[PDB]
Design an enzyme around this catalytic site. Structure first.
Site, PDB file in Angstrom:
ATOM      1  N   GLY A  51       0.779  -1.215   0.000  1.00 17.53           N
ATOM      2  CA  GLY A  51       0.000   0.000   0.000  1.00 17.53           C
ATOM      3  C   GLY A  51       0.816   1.272   0.000  1.00 17.53           C
ATOM      4  O   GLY A  51       0.284   2.339  -0.283  1.00 17.53           O
ATOM      5  N   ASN A  66      -7.747   4.908   6.016  1.00 19.90           N
ATOM      6  CA  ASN A  66      -7.769   5.053   4.564  1.00 19.90           C
ATOM      7  C   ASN A  66      -8.904   4.290   3.905  1.00 19.90           C
ATOM      8  O   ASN A  66      -9.336   3.210   4.364  1.00 19.90           O
ATOM      9  CB  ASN A  66      -6.430   4.610   3.971  1.00 19.90           C
ATOM     10  CG  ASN A  66      -6.394   3.130   3.665  1.00 19.90           C
ATOM     11  OD1 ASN A  66      -6.822   2.688   2.595  1.00 19.90           O
ATOM     12  ND2 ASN A  66      -5.897   2.344   4.619  1.00 19.90           N
ATOM     13  N   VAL A  68      -7.503 -10.832   0.282  1.00 17.66           N
ATOM     14  CA  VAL A  68      -8.938 -10.959   0.409  1.00 17.66           C
ATOM     15  C   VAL A  68      -9.442 -10.196   1.631  1.00 17.66           C
ATOM     16  O   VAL A  68     -10.473 -10.553   2.187  1.00 17.66           O
ATOM     17  CB  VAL A  68      -9.362 -12.428   0.543  1.00 17.66           C
ATOM     18  CG1 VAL A  68      -9.040 -13.180  -0.729  1.00 17.66           C
ATOM     19  CG2 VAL A  68      -8.680 -13.071   1.746  1.00 17.66           C
ATOM     20  N   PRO A  88     -10.756  -3.578   3.414  1.00 22.23           N
ATOM     21  CA  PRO A  88     -12.105  -3.199   3.850  1.00 22.23           C
ATOM     22  C   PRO A  88     -12.809  -2.225   2.897  1.00 22.23           C
ATOM     23  O   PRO A  88     -13.923  -1.789   3.201  1.00 22.23           O
ATOM     24  CB  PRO A  88     -11.848  -2.537   5.200  1.00 22.23           C
ATOM     25  CG  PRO A  88     -10.505  -1.915   5.056  1.00 22.23           C
ATOM     26  CD  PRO A  88      -9.713  -2.840   4.155  1.00 22.23           C
ATOM     27  N   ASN A  89     -12.176  -1.911   1.767  1.00 21.24           N
ATOM     28  CA  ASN A  89     -12.624  -0.823   0.891  1.00 21.24           C
ATOM     29  C   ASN A  89     -13.053  -1.255  -0.504  1.00 21.24           C
ATOM     30  O   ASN A  89     -13.154  -0.426  -1.412  1.00 21.24           O
ATOM     31  CB  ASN A  89     -11.515   0.215   0.771  1.00 21.24           C
ATOM     32  CG  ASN A  89     -11.088   0.741   2.115  1.00 21.24           C
ATOM     33  OD1 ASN A  89     -11.929   1.017   2.975  1.00 21.24           O
ATOM     34  ND2 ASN A  89      -9.785   0.853   2.321  1.00 21.24           N
ATOM     35  N   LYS A 142      -3.512 -12.811   2.771  1.00 23.27           N
ATOM     36  CA  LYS A 142      -3.544 -11.714   3.723  1.00 23.27           C
ATOM     37  C   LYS A 142      -4.941 -11.563   4.277  1.00 23.27           C
ATOM     38  O   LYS A 142      -5.904 -11.407   3.529  1.00 23.27           O
ATOM     39  CB  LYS A 142      -3.108 -10.398   3.079  1.00 23.27           C
ATOM     40  CG  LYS A 142      -2.994  -9.244   4.072  1.00 23.27           C
ATOM     41  CD  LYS A 142      -2.219  -8.084   3.474  1.00 23.27           C
ATOM     42  CE  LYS A 142      -2.124  -6.919   4.445  1.00 23.27           C
ATOM     43  NZ  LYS A 142      -1.312  -5.838   3.838  1.00 23.27           N
ATOM     44  N   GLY A 162      -1.895   1.485  12.271  1.00 25.69           N
ATOM     45  CA  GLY A 162      -1.091   2.118  13.291  1.00 25.69           C
ATOM     46  C   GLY A 162      -1.323   1.550  14.675  1.00 25.69           C
ATOM     47  O   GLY A 162      -1.745   0.408  14.841  1.00 25.69           O
ATOM     48  N   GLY A 204       0.742  -1.806  13.358  1.00 30.48           N
ATOM     49  CA  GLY A 204       1.163  -0.982  14.473  1.00 30.48           C
ATOM     50  C   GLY A 204       2.597  -1.145  14.959  1.00 30.48           C
ATOM     51  O   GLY A 204       2.890  -0.780  16.090  1.00 30.48           O
ATOM     52  N   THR A 264       2.433   2.475   8.623  1.00 27.23           N
ATOM     53  CA  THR A 264       1.957   3.705   9.247  1.00 27.23           C
ATOM     54  C   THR A 264       3.044   4.396  10.088  1.00 27.23           C
ATOM     55  O   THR A 264       3.106   5.626  10.141  1.00 27.23           O
ATOM     56  CB  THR A 264       0.721   3.415  10.107  1.00 27.23           C
ATOM     57  OG1 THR A 264      -0.328   2.921   9.271  1.00 27.23           O
ATOM     58  CG2 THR A 264       0.240   4.659  10.801  1.00 27.23           C
TER      59      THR A 264
END
Ligand SMILES: Cc1cc2nc3c(=O)[nH]c(=O)nc-3n(C[C@H](O)[C@H](O)[C@H](O)COP(=O)(O)O)c2cc1C
Ligand SMILES: O=C1c2ccccc2C(=O)c2c1nnn2-c1cc(F)c(-c2ccccc2F)c(F)c1
Ligand SMILES: CCCCCCCCCCCC[N+](C)(C)[O-]
Ligand SMILES: O=C(O)c1cc(=O)[nH]c(=O)[nH]1
Ligand code: NA
Ligand code: NA
Ligand code: NA
Length: 365
Positions: free
Chosen positions: A67, A115, A183, A186-187, A225, A276, A305, A327
């Protein structure tokens, strides 16, 4: 070393954040990195950070998570930053723009980001040619213990998700040391339901068939993932399918659609995945669970995180063979990579581990 760390953390990064919205800051970061404009890492990787897993040597266990470099534009700059491995993507079959802006949000009080990029991607063809331009350079890097991962996504309008992932395996598999079947974004509507058992077995069977069809020196490991937001049932089912099919590893975890109690950031109720510090222990516990469910026989890349040696070692002791971060770069900048590696080495020594390998899954024993 410790000088750059404090300057970035206390002055440069807070100033950049004050000037630039997060997506602009991200684009600038990718550009600078791709050009090698970096406080070049002074930390020399010691032997006790080396890990052998997924058919490869990793000079150190700290990678850049998917990402950051979605389109494979900054790979060499990321190795220069000191990452032991680089993962690019997610890459979708066809180019697509992702969600409307704004779609990235800082939560500085929480050391978090939210995001909803929505798989903005230059697409497989563009990324294919970008990686081909440095394919032999990467072969040498990989041989020298700096592997490359490629994270595969699916297009928003895709009718058949398995065919999107299959296309990714065919096009970028030959250029990757490992592939990731994501898979758990969340977007993208419907994506995470690909984590259910029947769906997942069918999907992963097709992916592995396509992978197995590649020539031997072009045949990557395949990892799945997963989200931090799975039910206990979901996790059991994933563990079962992964073992049944011989999936090579897991990446644990993507961002969370949960909003843990106590978030302070004004933007905490924005839609999207949270990353994070508020993700850290939710991720670590998911690693712990998946390691136990797979009897420690399935390599895990732990992510969520991480910004210190302690954070990394907690994930390693929970079951991770490798870790990633993203992050923390937002808040600490490039010096965070050397920081984590130096602190991790020190803690391994303090706790009586001969090296990273000895610490993997140690909490379970
Ligand atoms: C802005 C942003 C974009 C991301 N894009 C992707 C992506 O395209 N594919 C993916 O698998 N994970 C993506 N992630 C998730 C990260 O790879 C990682 O799993 C997660 O952020 C947790 O790590 P961190 O807390 O160190 O950031 C993204 C995360 C962020 C913050
Ligand atoms: O808010 C974000 C954010 C959000 C969602 C994805 C990504 C980012 C993000 O990269 C970011 C953010 N704020 N600052 N940065 C940021 C800015 C930089 F200039 C660098 C950099 C890179 C190479 C050399 C010198 C540097 F300073 C960096 F590593 C991070
Ligand atoms: C058990 C659920 C907990 C939700 C998230 C926990 C966050 C722990 C806070 C430590 C983070 C450090 N900081 C600077 C970002 O505040
Ligand atoms: O592109 C995105 O929105 C994205 C994909 C993913 O896998 N994870 C995440 O937090 N965002
Ligand atoms: Na290569
Ligand atoms: Na290979
Ligand atoms: Na359940």
């Amino acid at each position: 070393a410790t000088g750059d760390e404090r300057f970035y953390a206390e002055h440069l990064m807070p100033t950049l954040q004050g000037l630039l919205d997060p997506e602009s800051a991200h684009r600038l970061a990718v550009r600078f990195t791709s050009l090698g404009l970096l406080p070049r890492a002074r930390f020399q990787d010691s032997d006790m950070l080396e890990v052998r897993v997924l058919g490869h040597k990793f000079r150190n266990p700290v990678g850049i998570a998917a990402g950051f470099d979605k389109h494979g534009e900054a790979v060499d700059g990321l190795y220069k930053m000191g990452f032991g491995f680089v993962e690019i993507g997610s890459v979708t079959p066809k180019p697509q723009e992702g969600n409307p802006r704004p779609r990235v949000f800082r939560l500085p009080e929480d050391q978090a980001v939210i995001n909803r990029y929505g798989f903005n991607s230059h697409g497989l063809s563009v990324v294919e040619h970008r990686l081909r331009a440095r394919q032999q350079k990467q072969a040498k890097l990989t041989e020298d213990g700096l592997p490359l991962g490629v994270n595969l996504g699916k297009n928003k309008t895709s009718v058949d998700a398995a065919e999107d992932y299959a296309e990714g395996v065919r096009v970028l598999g030959p250029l990757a040391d490992y592939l990731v079947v994501n898979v758990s974004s969340p977007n993208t509507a419907g994506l995470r339901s690909l984590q259910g058992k029947a769906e997942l077995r069918r999907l992963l069977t097709k992916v592995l068939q396509e992978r197995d069809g590649l020539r031997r020196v072009h045949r990557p490991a395949v990892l799945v993932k997963i989200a931090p937001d799975l039910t206990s049932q979901d996790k059991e089912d994933i563990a079962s399918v992964v073992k049944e099919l011989g999936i090579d590893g897991l990446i644990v975890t993507n961002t969370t659609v949960s909003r843990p109690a106590g978030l302070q950031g004004a933007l905490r109720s924005e839609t999207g995945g949270l990353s994070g510090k508020p993700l850290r222990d939710l991720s670590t516990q998911t690693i712990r669970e998946m390691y136990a469910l797979t009897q420690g026989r399935v390599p895990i890349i732990g992510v969520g995180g991480v910004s210190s040696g302690q954070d990394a070692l907690e994930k390693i002791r929970a079951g991770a063979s490798l870790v990633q971060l993203y992050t923390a770069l937002t808040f600490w900048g490039p010096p965070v990579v050397g920081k984590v590696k130096r602190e991790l080495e020190a803690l391994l020594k303090e706790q009586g581990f001969g090296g990273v390998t000895d610490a993997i899954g140690a909490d379970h024993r």
